[PDB]
Amino acid sequence: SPVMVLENIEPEIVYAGYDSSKPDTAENLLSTLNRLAGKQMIQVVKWAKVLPGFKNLPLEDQITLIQYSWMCLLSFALSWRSYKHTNSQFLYFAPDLVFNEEKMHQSAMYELCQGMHQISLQFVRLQLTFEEYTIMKVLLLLSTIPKDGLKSQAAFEEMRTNYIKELRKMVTSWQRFYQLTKLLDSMHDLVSDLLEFCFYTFRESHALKVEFPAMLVEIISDQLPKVESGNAKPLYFHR
Ligand SMILES: C[C@]12CC[C@H]3[C@@H](CCC4=CC(=O)CC[C@@]43C)[C@@H]1CC[C@@H]2C(=O)CO
């Protein structure tokens, strides 16, 4: 049943809010992009809190998972918007913020922009259906746990596996499932890339003149303060 509920809960529109006009170099794209991230998060939490099964684990587990997987979320989402609106032609961050080989170019991010684009590209080729995306997206929320587990760990695995079963239910064949689960797996590869960059732009804020809101502040100072190592255990799907 969930799928139905997911269409409903599937977050809406979010504006980045960039007073575009004068030269927009690194110090410009990133502070607005971060700002953008800060607003979508308020949206992701609103989304997750009604999710089937997930809304059932105590508030502690819920927030942890959102933290260890926030980057996957937003990035996976960027791909879908880029794919739904521009046919993947571009990276649709926000209605008021679209990227062309020029924005990616002078965003000081061209390389990661290309990676997130390579994802949207896989969406087109596979011609992803909302159903698939919505379920895959829950799988990303449920894809990176604390190396040592969760309080409601047992309840957690049954849940995720159920969503697995659901995605395969949706896939109804085994090749499709496979392509989709392999896509999500690869995501773990991109996200680690996006995170190390986000982290060093964090640690080197003022000096690079790249600001972060406050919402994203309390999250990164929490996410990478010690996990820049390997206490963040992603849960792949294949080998
Ligand atoms: C965190 C980040 C700015 C904000 C974006 C993130 C990439 C994924 C993403 C996709 C979206 O659809 C909205 C903003 C955002 C969440 C970037 C990767 C590096 C960059 C920085 O490191 C900024 O200094």
Side-chain angles (χ1 to χ4, degrees), residues 1-6 8-17 19-157 159-239:
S1 177
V3 47
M4 308 297 290
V5 326
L6 309 198
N8 171 190
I9 67 178
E10 168 60 356
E12 299 159 302
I13 302 167
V14 175
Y15 276 83
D19 182 3
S20 305
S21 189
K22 277 201 70 59
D24 33 17
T25 308
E27 59 167 358
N28 315 111
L29 302 305
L30 310 182
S31 57
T32 298
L33 285 162
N34 282 322
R35 236 76 173 191
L36 171 58
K39 286 176 158 57
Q40 311 187 324
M41 229 46 257
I42 201 175
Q43 173 179 48
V44 166
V45 284
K46 183 270 217 66
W47 175 65
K49 54 167 180 166
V50 260
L51 200 67
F54 182 79
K55 101 211 301 305
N56 288 307
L57 292 193
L59 177 57
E60 284 56 55
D61 275 41
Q62 286 166 276
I63 292 190
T64 295
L65 281 64
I66 312 290
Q67 275 184 159
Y68 275 116
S69 75
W70 79 289
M71 246 308 97
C72 291
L73 309 163
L74 303 183
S75 63
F76 197 60
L78 174 45
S79 280
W80 171 261
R81 299 197 294 280
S82 294
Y83 166 63
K84 276 280 63 60
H85 311 152
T86 73
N87 240 79
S88 284
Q89 288 265 50
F90 310 121
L91 285 171
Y92 199 106
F93 293 85
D96 62 357
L97 204 54
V98 176
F99 280 53
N100 174 132
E101 285 182 31
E102 274 48 58
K103 304 290 193 58
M104 309 164 69
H105 205 74
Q106 211 195 250
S107 68
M109 271 185 67
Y110 188 115
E111 273 308 53
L112 311 80
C113 254
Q114 157 184 163
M116 293 184 298
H117 188 273
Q118 287 300 151
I119 296 295
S120 73
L121 299 181
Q122 303 179 65
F123 280 35
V124 220
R125 287 192 176 192
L126 292 158
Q127 289 160 207
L128 193 68
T129 62
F130 186 68
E131 287 95 355
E132 273 145 26
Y133 170 73
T134 197
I135 295 302
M136 288 159 86
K137 193 162 55 187
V138 176
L139 290 191
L140 300 176
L141 168 58
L142 309 172
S143 194
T144 315
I145 64 184
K147 78 175 301 174
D148 300 305
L150 286 167
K151 294 160 44 179
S152 338
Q153 187 68 5
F156 175 73
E157 125 77 53
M159 166 144 93
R160 189 200 71 163
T161 183
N162 277 314
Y163 271 98
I164 301 185
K165 276 71 170 307
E166 194 45 44
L167 178 52
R168 176 157 271 183
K169 180 80 63 60
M170 195 307 101
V171 187
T172 325
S173 293
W174 289 310
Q175 166 181 54
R176 237 58 167 174
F177 181 79
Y178 176 63
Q179 302 174 315
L180 303 178
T181 55
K182 228 289 184 157
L183 174 158
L184 294 167
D185 273 24
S186 72
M187 164 176 251
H188 285 295
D189 294 353
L190 179 77
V191 173
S192 299
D193 281 6
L194 292 177
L195 285 171
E196 200 187 8
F197 181 80
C198 170
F199 192 45
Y200 211 84
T201 63
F202 188 79
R203 190 147 45 197
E204 269 280 64
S205 293
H206 86 72
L208 300 182
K209 306 189 186 184
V210 184
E211 193 178 303
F212 295 61
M215 184 190 276
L216 215 54
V217 173
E218 274 117 71
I219 281 190
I220 298 179
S221 120
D222 202 311
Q223 178 189 256
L224 302 135
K226 59 99 63 58
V227 195
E228 183 53 333
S229 53
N231 295 175
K233 176 191 174 185
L235 314 168
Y236 298 150
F237 276 103
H238 302 280
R239 66 159 297 78

Coordinates of all heavy atoms in Angstrom, one line a residue, residues 10-75, unseen atoms left out:
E10 N 5.1 12.8 -1.0 CA 6.2 13.3 -1.8 C 6.4 14.8 -1.8 O 5.6 15.5 -2.5 CB 6.0 12.8 -3.3 CG 7.0 13.4 -4.3 CD 8.4 13.2 -4.0 OE1 8.8 12.6 -3.0 OE2 9.3 13.6 -4.8
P11 N 7.3 15.3 -1.0 CA 7.6 16.7 -0.9 C 7.3 17.6 -2.2 O 7.4 17.1 -3.3 CB 9.1 16.8 -0.4 CG 9.6 15.4 -0.9 CD 8.5 14.5 -0.6
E12 N 7.1 18.9 -1.9 CA 6.8 19.8 -3.0 C 7.9 20.7 -3.5 O 9.1 20.3 -3.6 CB 5.6 20.7 -2.6 CG 4.3 20.0 -2.3 CD 3.4 20.8 -1.5 OE1 3.8 21.2 -0.3 OE2 2.2 21.0 -1.9
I13 N 7.6 21.9 -3.8 CA 8.5 22.9 -4.3 C 9.3 23.7 -3.2 O 8.8 23.9 -2.1 CB 7.7 24.0 -5.1 CG1 7.0 23.3 -6.3 CG2 8.7 25.0 -5.7 CD1 6.0 24.1 -7.0
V14 N 10.6 23.9 -3.5 CA 11.5 24.6 -2.7 C 12.3 25.6 -3.5 O 12.8 25.3 -4.5 CB 12.4 23.7 -1.9 CG1 13.4 24.4 -1.1 CG2 11.6 22.7 -1.0
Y15 N 12.4 26.8 -3.0 CA 13.2 27.9 -3.6 C 14.6 28.1 -3.0 O 14.7 28.1 -1.7 CB 12.5 29.2 -3.7 CG 11.5 29.3 -4.8 CD1 10.2 28.8 -4.8 CD2 11.9 30.0 -6.0 CE1 9.3 28.9 -5.8 CE2 11.0 30.1 -7.1 CZ 9.7 29.6 -7.0 OH 8.8 29.6 -8.0
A16 N 15.6 28.2 -3.8 CA 17.0 28.4 -3.2 C 17.1 29.9 -2.8 O 17.7 30.2 -1.8 CB 18.0 28.1 -4.3
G17 N 16.5 30.8 -3.6 CA 16.6 32.2 -3.2 C 18.0 32.8 -3.4 O 18.7 33.0 -2.5
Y18 N 18.3 33.1 -4.8 CA 19.5 33.8 -5.1 C 19.4 35.1 -5.8 O 18.9 35.2 -6.9 CB 20.4 33.0 -6.0
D19 N 19.9 36.1 -5.1 CA 19.8 37.4 -5.7 C 20.9 37.4 -6.9 O 21.9 38.1 -6.8 CB 20.1 38.5 -4.7 CG 20.0 39.9 -5.3 OD1 19.7 40.1 -6.5 OD2 20.3 40.9 -4.5
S20 N 20.6 36.7 -7.9 CA 21.5 36.6 -9.1 C 21.5 38.0 -9.8 O 20.5 38.7 -9.8 CB 21.0 35.5 -10.1 OG 20.9 34.3 -9.4
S21 N 22.7 38.3 -10.4 CA 22.9 39.5 -11.1 C 24.3 39.7 -11.4 O 24.8 39.5 -12.6 CB 22.4 40.7 -10.3 OG 22.4 41.9 -11.0
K22 N 25.1 40.0 -10.4 CA 26.6 40.2 -10.6 C 27.3 38.9 -10.6 O 26.7 37.8 -10.3 CB 27.1 41.1 -9.5 CG 27.0 42.5 -9.7 CD 28.0 43.3 -8.9 CE 29.4 43.1 -9.4 NZ 29.6 43.5 -10.8
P23 N 28.6 38.9 -11.0 CA 29.4 37.7 -11.1 C 29.2 36.7 -10.0 O 29.3 37.0 -8.8 CB 30.8 38.2 -11.1 CG 30.7 39.5 -11.9 CD 29.4 40.1 -11.3
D24 N 28.8 35.4 -10.4 CA 28.6 34.4 -9.5 C 29.7 33.3 -9.5 O 29.6 32.3 -10.3 CB 27.2 33.8 -9.7 CG 26.8 33.8 -11.2 OD1 27.7 34.0 -12.0 OD2 25.6 33.6 -11.4
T25 N 30.7 33.5 -8.7 CA 31.8 32.5 -8.6 C 31.6 31.6 -7.4 O 30.5 31.7 -6.8 CB 33.1 33.3 -8.4 OG1 33.3 34.4 -9.4 CG2 34.3 32.4 -8.5
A26 N 32.5 30.7 -7.2 CA 32.5 29.7 -6.1 C 31.8 30.2 -4.9 O 30.8 29.6 -4.4 CB 33.9 29.3 -5.8
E27 N 32.3 31.3 -4.3 CA 31.7 31.9 -3.1 C 30.2 32.2 -3.2 O 29.5 32.5 -2.2 CB 32.5 33.2 -2.7 CG 32.5 34.3 -3.7 CD 32.9 35.6 -3.2 OE1 33.2 35.6 -2.0 OE2 33.0 36.6 -3.9
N28 N 29.7 32.2 -4.5 CA 28.3 32.5 -4.7 C 27.4 31.3 -4.9 O 26.4 31.2 -4.2 CB 28.2 33.4 -5.9 CG 29.2 34.5 -5.9 OD1 30.2 34.5 -6.7 ND2 29.1 35.5 -5.0
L29 N 27.8 30.3 -5.7 CA 27.0 29.1 -6.0 C 26.8 28.3 -4.7 O 25.7 28.0 -4.3 CB 27.7 28.3 -7.0 CG 27.9 28.8 -8.4 CD1 26.7 29.4 -9.1 CD2 29.0 29.9 -8.4
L30 N 27.9 28.0 -4.0 CA 27.9 27.2 -2.8 C 27.1 27.7 -1.6 O 26.4 27.0 -1.0 CB 29.3 26.9 -2.4 CG 30.2 26.4 -3.5 CD1 31.6 26.1 -3.0 CD2 29.6 25.2 -4.1
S31 N 27.2 29.0 -1.3 CA 26.5 29.6 -0.2 C 25.0 29.5 -0.4 O 24.2 29.3 0.5 CB 26.9 31.0 0.2 OG 26.8 31.9 -0.9
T32 N 24.6 29.7 -1.7 CA 23.2 29.6 -2.0 C 22.7 28.1 -2.1 O 21.6 27.7 -1.7 CB 22.8 30.2 -3.4 OG1 23.1 31.6 -3.3 CG2 21.3 30.1 -3.7
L33 N 23.6 27.3 -2.6 CA 23.3 25.8 -2.7 C 23.2 25.3 -1.3 O 22.2 24.6 -1.0 CB 24.4 25.1 -3.5 CG 24.3 25.4 -5.0 CD1 25.6 25.1 -5.7 CD2 23.2 24.6 -5.6
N34 N 24.1 25.7 -0.4 CA 24.0 25.2 1.0 C 22.6 25.7 1.5 O 21.8 24.9 1.9 CB 25.1 25.8 1.8 CG 26.4 25.0 1.6 OD1 26.4 23.8 1.5 ND2 27.5 25.8 1.7
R35 N 22.4 27.0 1.4 CA 21.1 27.6 1.8 C 20.0 26.8 1.3 O 19.1 26.4 2.1 CB 21.0 29.0 1.3 CG 20.8 30.1 2.4 CD 22.1 30.4 3.2 NE 21.9 31.5 4.1 CZ 22.9 32.1 4.8 NH1 24.1 31.7 4.6 NH2 22.6 33.1 5.6
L36 N 20.0 26.4 0.0 CA 19.0 25.6 -0.6 C 18.9 24.3 0.2 O 17.8 23.9 0.6 CB 19.4 25.3 -2.0 CG 18.5 24.2 -2.8 CD1 17.1 24.7 -2.8 CD2 19.0 24.0 -4.2
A37 N 20.0 23.6 0.4 CA 20.0 22.4 1.2 C 19.3 22.5 2.5 O 18.5 21.7 2.9 CB 21.4 21.9 1.4
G38 N 19.6 23.6 3.2 CA 19.0 23.9 4.5 C 17.4 23.9 4.5 O 16.8 23.5 5.4
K39 N 16.9 24.4 3.4 CA 15.4 24.5 3.2 C 14.8 23.1 2.9 O 13.7 22.8 3.4 CB 15.0 25.5 2.2 CG 15.2 27.0 2.7 CD 14.9 28.0 1.6 CE 14.5 29.3 2.2 NZ 15.6 29.9 3.0
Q40 N 15.4 22.4 2.0 CA 14.9 21.1 1.6 C 14.8 20.1 2.8 O 13.9 19.3 2.9 CB 15.8 20.4 0.5 CG 16.1 21.4 -0.7 CD 16.8 20.6 -1.8 OE1 17.6 19.7 -1.5 NE2 16.5 21.0 -3.0
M41 N 15.8 20.2 3.7 CA 15.9 19.4 4.8 C 14.6 19.5 5.7 O 14.0 18.5 6.1 CB 17.1 19.7 5.7 CG 17.9 18.5 6.1 SD 18.2 17.4 4.7 CE 17.0 16.1 5.0
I42 N 14.1 20.7 5.9 CA 12.9 21.0 6.7 C 11.8 20.1 6.0 O 10.9 19.7 6.6 CB 12.5 22.5 6.6 CG1 11.6 22.8 7.8 CG2 11.8 22.8 5.3 CD1 11.3 24.3 7.9
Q43 N 11.9 20.0 4.7 CA 11.0 19.2 3.8 C 11.2 17.7 4.0 O 10.2 17.0 4.2 CB 11.2 19.7 2.4 CG 10.4 19.0 1.3 CD 10.7 19.5 -0.1 OE1 11.8 19.8 -0.5 NE2 9.6 19.8 -0.8
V44 N 12.4 17.3 3.9 CA 12.7 15.8 4.1 C 12.2 15.3 5.4 O 11.7 14.2 5.5 CB 14.2 15.6 4.0 CG1 14.5 14.2 4.5 CG2 14.7 15.7 2.6
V45 N 12.4 16.1 6.5 CA 11.9 15.6 7.8 C 10.3 15.5 7.8 O 9.8 14.6 8.3 CB 12.3 16.6 9.0 CG1 13.8 16.3 9.3 CG2 12.1 18.0 8.6
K46 N 9.7 16.5 7.2 CA 8.3 16.5 7.1 C 7.8 15.3 6.3 O 6.8 14.7 6.6 CB 7.8 17.8 6.3 CG 6.3 18.0 6.2 CD 5.8 17.4 4.9 CE 4.7 18.2 4.3 NZ 5.2 19.5 3.8
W47 N 8.6 14.9 5.4 CA 8.3 13.7 4.5 C 8.5 12.4 5.4 O 7.6 11.7 5.5 CB 9.3 13.6 3.3 CG 9.2 12.4 2.5 CD1 8.1 12.0 1.8 CD2 10.1 11.4 2.4 NE1 8.3 10.8 1.2 CE2 9.5 10.4 1.5 CE3 11.4 11.2 2.8 CZ2 10.2 9.2 1.1 CZ3 12.1 10.0 2.5 CH2 11.5 9.0 1.6
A48 N 9.7 12.2 5.9 CA 10.0 11.0 6.7 C 9.1 10.7 7.8 O 8.7 9.6 8.0 CB 11.5 11.1 7.2
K49 N 8.6 11.7 8.5 CA 7.8 11.5 9.7 C 6.4 10.8 9.4 O 5.8 10.4 10.3 CB 7.5 12.9 10.4 CG 7.0 14.0 9.6 CD 6.5 15.1 10.4 CE 6.0 16.2 9.5 NZ 5.1 17.2 10.3
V50 N 6.0 10.8 8.2 CA 4.7 10.1 7.9 C 5.0 8.7 7.1 O 4.0 8.0 7.0 CB 3.8 11.0 7.0 CG1 2.7 11.6 7.9 CG2 4.6 12.1 6.3
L51 N 6.2 8.5 6.8 CA 6.6 7.2 6.1 C 6.1 6.0 6.8 O 6.2 5.9 8.1 CB 8.1 7.2 5.9 CG 8.7 6.3 4.9 CD1 8.3 6.8 3.5 CD2 10.2 6.3 5.0
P52 N 5.6 5.0 6.1 CA 5.2 3.7 6.6 C 6.3 3.0 7.3 O 7.4 2.8 6.7 CB 4.6 3.0 5.4 CG 4.1 4.1 4.5 CD 5.2 5.1 4.6
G53 N 6.1 2.5 8.5 CA 7.1 1.8 9.3 C 8.1 2.6 9.9 O 8.4 2.5 11.1
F54 N 8.7 3.6 9.2 CA 9.7 4.5 9.7 C 9.2 5.4 10.8 O 9.8 5.7 11.8 CB 10.2 5.3 8.5 CG 11.3 6.3 8.9 CD1 12.6 5.8 9.1 CD2 11.1 7.6 9.0 CE1 13.7 6.7 9.4 CE2 12.1 8.6 9.3 CZ 13.4 8.1 9.5
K55 N 7.9 6.0 10.6 CA 7.3 6.9 11.6 C 7.1 6.1 12.9 O 6.7 6.7 13.9 CB 6.0 7.4 11.1 CG 4.8 6.8 11.7 CD 3.6 6.7 10.7 CE 3.1 8.1 10.2 NZ 2.8 9.1 11.3
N56 N 7.3 4.8 12.9 CA 7.0 3.9 14.1 C 8.2 3.7 15.0 O 8.1 3.4 16.2 CB 6.5 2.6 13.6 CG 5.1 2.6 13.1 OD1 4.2 3.1 13.8 ND2 4.9 2.1 11.9
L57 N 9.5 3.9 14.5 CA 10.6 3.8 15.3 C 10.7 5.1 16.1 O 10.6 6.2 15.6 CB 11.9 3.6 14.5 CG 12.1 2.3 13.7 CD1 13.5 2.2 13.2 CD2 11.7 1.1 14.6
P58 N 11.0 5.0 17.4 CA 11.1 6.2 18.3 C 11.9 7.3 17.6 O 12.8 7.1 16.9 CB 11.7 5.6 19.6 CG 12.5 4.4 19.1 CD 11.5 3.8 18.2
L59 N 11.6 8.5 18.0 CA 12.2 9.7 17.5 C 13.7 9.7 17.3 O 14.3 10.3 16.5 CB 11.8 10.9 18.3 CG 12.5 12.3 17.9 CD1 12.2 12.6 16.5 CD2 11.9 13.3 18.9
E60 N 14.4 8.9 18.2 CA 15.9 8.8 18.2 C 16.4 8.2 16.9 O 17.2 8.8 16.2 CB 16.4 8.0 19.4 CG 16.3 8.7 20.7 CD 15.0 9.2 21.1 OE1 14.0 8.5 21.1 OE2 14.9 10.5 21.4
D61 N 15.9 7.0 16.6 CA 16.3 6.3 15.4 C 16.0 7.1 14.2 O 16.9 7.2 13.3 CB 15.7 4.9 15.4 CG 16.4 3.8 16.1 OD1 16.9 4.1 17.3 OD2 16.5 2.7 15.6
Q62 N 14.8 7.7 14.1 CA 14.4 8.4 13.0 C 15.4 9.5 12.6 O 16.0 9.6 11.5 CB 13.0 9.1 13.2 CG 11.9 8.1 13.2 CD 10.6 8.6 13.7 OE1 10.4 8.6 15.0 NE2 9.8 9.2 12.9
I63 N 15.7 10.4 13.6 CA 16.6 11.5 13.3 C 18.1 11.0 13.0 O 18.7 11.6 12.1 CB 16.7 12.5 14.5 CG1 15.4 13.2 14.7 CG2 17.8 13.5 14.4 CD1 15.4 14.3 15.7
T64 N 18.5 10.0 13.7 CA 19.9 9.5 13.3 C 19.9 9.2 11.8 O 20.7 9.8 11.1 CB 20.2 8.2 14.1 OG1 20.3 8.5 15.5 CG2 21.6 7.6 13.7
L65 N 19.0 8.3 11.4 CA 19.0 7.9 10.0 C 19.0 9.0 9.0 O 19.6 9.0 8.0 CB 17.8 6.9 9.7 CG 18.0 5.5 10.1 CD1 18.2 5.4 11.6 CD2 16.8 4.7 9.7
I66 N 18.2 10.1 9.3 CA 18.1 11.2 8.5 C 19.5 11.9 8.4 O 19.8 12.5 7.3 CB 17.1 12.3 9.0 CG1 15.8 11.6 9.3 CG2 16.8 13.3 7.9 CD1 14.9 11.1 8.2
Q67 N 20.2 11.9 9.5 CA 21.5 12.6 9.5 C 22.5 11.8 8.7 O 23.2 12.4 7.9 CB 22.0 12.7 11.0 CG 21.4 14.0 11.6 CD 22.0 14.2 13.0 OE1 22.0 15.3 13.5 NE2 22.4 13.1 13.6
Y68 N 22.7 10.5 9.0 CA 23.6 9.7 8.3 C 23.3 9.5 6.8 O 24.2 9.1 6.0 CB 23.7 8.3 8.9 CG 24.6 8.2 10.1 CD1 24.1 7.9 11.4 CD2 26.0 8.3 10.0 CE1 24.9 7.8 12.5 CE2 26.8 8.2 11.1 CZ 26.3 7.9 12.3 OH 27.1 7.8 13.4
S69 N 22.1 9.9 6.4 CA 21.7 9.8 5.0 C 21.2 11.0 4.3 O 20.8 11.0 3.1 CB 20.6 8.7 4.8 OG 19.4 9.3 5.3
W70 N 21.3 12.2 5.0 CA 20.8 13.4 4.4 C 21.4 13.7 3.0 O 20.6 14.0 2.0 CB 21.1 14.6 5.3 CG 22.4 15.1 5.2 CD1 23.6 14.5 5.7 CD2 22.9 16.4 4.6 NE1 24.7 15.3 5.5 CE2 24.3 16.4 4.8 CE3 22.2 17.4 3.9 CZ2 25.0 17.5 4.3 CZ3 23.0 18.5 3.5 CH2 24.4 18.5 3.7
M71 N 22.7 13.6 2.8 CA 23.3 13.8 1.5 C 22.7 13.0 0.4 O 22.5 13.4 -0.8 CB 24.8 13.7 1.5 CG 25.6 15.0 1.3 SD 25.1 15.9 -0.2 CE 24.0 17.1 0.5
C72 N 22.5 11.7 0.6 CA 22.0 10.7 -0.3 C 20.6 11.3 -0.8 O 20.4 11.5 -2.0 CB 21.7 9.4 0.3 SG 23.2 8.4 0.8
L73 N 19.8 11.6 0.2 CA 18.4 12.1 0.0 C 18.4 13.3 -1.0 O 17.9 13.1 -2.2 CB 17.9 12.6 1.3 CG 17.9 11.6 2.5 CD1 17.7 12.3 3.8 CD2 16.9 10.6 2.3
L74 N 18.9 14.4 -0.6 CA 18.9 15.6 -1.5 C 19.5 15.3 -2.8 O 18.9 15.7 -3.9 CB 19.7 16.7 -0.8 CG 19.1 17.1 0.6 CD1 19.8 18.3 1.2 CD2 17.6 17.4 0.5
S75 N 20.7 14.6 -2.9 CA 21.3 14.3 -4.2 C 20.4 13.5 -5.1 O 20.3 13.7 -6.2 CB 22.7 13.7 -3.9 OG 22.6 12.5 -3.3

